[PDB]
Amino acid sequence: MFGEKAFDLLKELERSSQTIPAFDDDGVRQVLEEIKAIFEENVAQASSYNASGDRSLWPLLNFRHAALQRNKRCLLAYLYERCRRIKALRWEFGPIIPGDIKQALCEPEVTFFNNYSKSLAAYMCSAGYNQGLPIDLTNNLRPPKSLYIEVRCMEDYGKFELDDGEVIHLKKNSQHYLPRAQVESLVRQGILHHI
Template identity: 50%
Template sequence: MFCEKVIELIRELHRMSDGQLPAFNEDGLRQVLQEMEALYEQNQTDVNEAKSEGRADLIPSIKLRHCCLLRNQRCVTAYLYDRLLRIRALRWEYGSVLPANVRFHMCAEELQWFNQYKKSLASFMRSLGGGEGLDITQDMKPPKSLYIEVRCLKDHGEFEIDDGTVILLKKNSQHFLPRWKCEQLIRQGVLEHVVS
């Protein structure tokens, strides 16, 4: 049956419903495009024959292949679009720098899209707050205090805070830090928020 290949792509995304980005399936996508090309060419020959020899009985077959073309088109669009949604989410979960193993799963165009999304978001955030800019990825949960108690879950090296002090983030050490400085690190699982 036609359009079986493209379902594999869709399934791949559907299995990872938590928003993880599977590797870009270039090979699968190429196979789908090849199938579409074959369908299109067959339809062309049948259309020409139906026109020149007046064979109206070919029309149902042409219609069937046309449906398959539309279906492939829909699935490929959905595949690419869903991946973009996931990539956009990564910007909010990881911050502007992605770890290599995540970046590795994107194709060149997706990396380009990610960079442009980053730029648009950054210029939007700069335009807010009366010329001073406002980081809207901060404070997803309303803050209760400016400083919070955090514990290090792994060695992260040196870390500089606003007043210029440098702290060493060593595994299992506990610190009292400005909230806005460590929010990102908490999301990334480097620090843990300790609530007393």
């Protein structure tokens, strides 16, 4: 408001807990149309004879400084909480099943997202094995059993199961030719509290 809105900025995701319909790129547009409205004054009097080198201008310096503080750190929040919750579900699956939308990528976030994906790439490479065994770590926790059967679940959408089946219809009654490598992604996104 004069530096308050970030609690309003995540509110696009207010309902999006684990029953999420979809997500969007809210709250940047007018808000960084600000920053080019203000730099004019922030560097207006740089070593100027506008006041002939006098002490009085010290509030202006700190004005710029705190403005930068608030802007940058709300940016860190709008970055880091997005990455962190998405990192939770991205530990609940690789890039097998990515986000519900991939339309709310705040455009530069391609680098951000994919770098963290390559965080897990490094993780896989060094960990698991020295050459790198991608170590099955947070999903598909069945003890050694059959490889190919389907079962019942509870209505997920997004429909991104590209893994090894023709079309499995990943919802309740995703009940078709499912191999093990097909069904390798789900433990908790809202799917199989019930076989």
